[PDB]
Structure 1
């Protein structure tokens, strides 16, 4: 029922890569009549296996309207994560093709959807650690879902954060100062990355208005080594990504709330929900 044979997992096209993971469009066709359903299959990049095995345990224990649905596993030593395929892709591929279709009312509805999904993650005691628009999938012009949990970690009961040990290649331009300074990840660290994802959403994911592109015009040339140190100084000086063009005061003021230096001063995901919903008539 929840098992998927590798032989029936017919490879169609690549969907996204990482550094220890890759995602493909496959059709699970055990009848062989080409009538099976299209699925997304996450597997290891040619270890690292227990990392994906821990991701399976997380997505299996997740059931929400705004979280990509778990379908099952394909075992080989190796293992694959089988989920629902969302043909529109992520916001990164969707938004630049729909600048005319997606208005402020719609982006606000995506914000609510990203927040409800994130809040449900917070309730299950997890920290996402990779909240970016590239990981927010479009189900329709009305529905979005969180599509990757590759750096998601469980917060120890009664503890407020998770401390990352290794952290080989994390999205530093989406990171709060606690993460950059102490390798500590709170639910409030996820809030900050939402603010950044929101900025991307408001800029229709315009490539040259991305957090990386903009922060490197405030920091300048740096390379891997110094990137984080200069990033911390910028944020220490109160500097933040500016209000996107056409963004109203009310929305940017909710975005600024995610970006309070101290984890304890930042807004919650439930407050963002109520906050955005109040702007939707």
Structure 2
């Protein structure tokens, strides 16, 4: 079985990044023991097993040019994927401003929309769409690189109701996710709009969605922060345009209060393609 990786041949090189419960490391799968084997990205849980198994099964069945490739498993379980040395958009964009212009940013935007549209056609909701979860294949190509919070939508139903909201990226969340823990495909569209703002600002820390929303609502509300966030959104207030009128209009359509007034990923692709011709 080419999808079964033996523990004794999986050699750790360095850490790549980590979340609260999971981590990704650069390993070499070296059965010949001479450091000639291929380099792979390995996702493991820190010393949630049920959630990782579900996550592995989802990725095993996704095949798209803008989705990170599943390679296999190491059985306790570890997820084995292809290694992208340029890393996440969050770390790549600040170091490569001179290489990446607005035209390339809009191509990245189309690519994220295509990968997301494919996911949504398989009845899944991502729930964690941000620049930190987008990998750089090359200066011409990006891939959605993580599915840690991904959930299947019930048949003859349009949303998944979340029970555990403890590690939620609240500054990327739509009003319905904040008020009722209801995740629709339209909720993923809202998060894309915030990811697009990150992309246009080159993932600058001082201009991050969290930095900007805290300046809008005040940073001393503590436990009332999410309530204040809900209030500002209810008023019609949104993240400002980075220091491109037509791109900002597609972004504002991602941020329509009611999920029904929001566009679809297919509609956004048409929008970006019209601007690239």
TM-score (norm 1): 0.97
Shift of 1:20: 1.4
Distance in 1, Cα, partners of 2:205 & 2:189: 22
Shift of 1:224: 5.7
Distance in 2, Cα, partners of 1:195 & 1:262: 15
Give the structure 2 partner of residue 107 of structure 1.
105
Shift of 1:227: 2.2
Q: How many residues get paired? A: 276
Distance in 1, Cα, partners of 2:275 & 2:56: 37
Change (3 A) 1:156 1:229: same
Shift of 1:222: 4.0
Between 1:213-222 and 1:6-15, the stretch displaced more is: 213-222
- Runs of 4+ more than 6 Å apart: none
Where does the alignment leave 5 or more consecutive residues of structure 1 unmatched?
none
Shift of 1:68: 0.4
Structure-to-structure mapping, 1:164-203, within 5 angstroms: 164-203=162-201
Distance in 1, Cα, partners of 2:129 & 2:135: 12
Query: 1:25-63: per-residue Cα shift (whole Å, max 9, x none)?
Result: 0011111121111111000012x1001011001111211
Query: 1:179-215: per-residue Cα shift (whole Å, max 9, x none)?
Result: 0001000000000000000000000000111101111
Distance in 1, Cα, partners of 2:179 & 2:135: 30
Give the structure 2 partner of residue 137 of structure 1.
135
Shift of 1:219: 1.7
TM-score (norm 2): 0.98
Shift of 1:223: 6.3
Change (3 A) 1:44 1:224: farther
Partner of 2:59, secondary structure, is helix
Distance in 2, Cα, partners of 1:222 & 1:270: 40
Change (3 A) 1:7 1:222: farther
Give the structure 2 partner of residue 35 of structure 1.
36
Distance in 2, Cα, partners of 1:227 & 1:22: 28
Query: RMSD value over aligned CA atoms?
Result: 0.9
Where does the alignment leave 5 or more consecutive residues of structure 2 unmatched?
none
Shift of 1:221: 2.2
Between 1:257-266 and 1:214-223, the stretch displaced more is: 214-223
Give the structure 1 partner of residue 11 of structure 2.
10
Shift of 1:16: 1.3
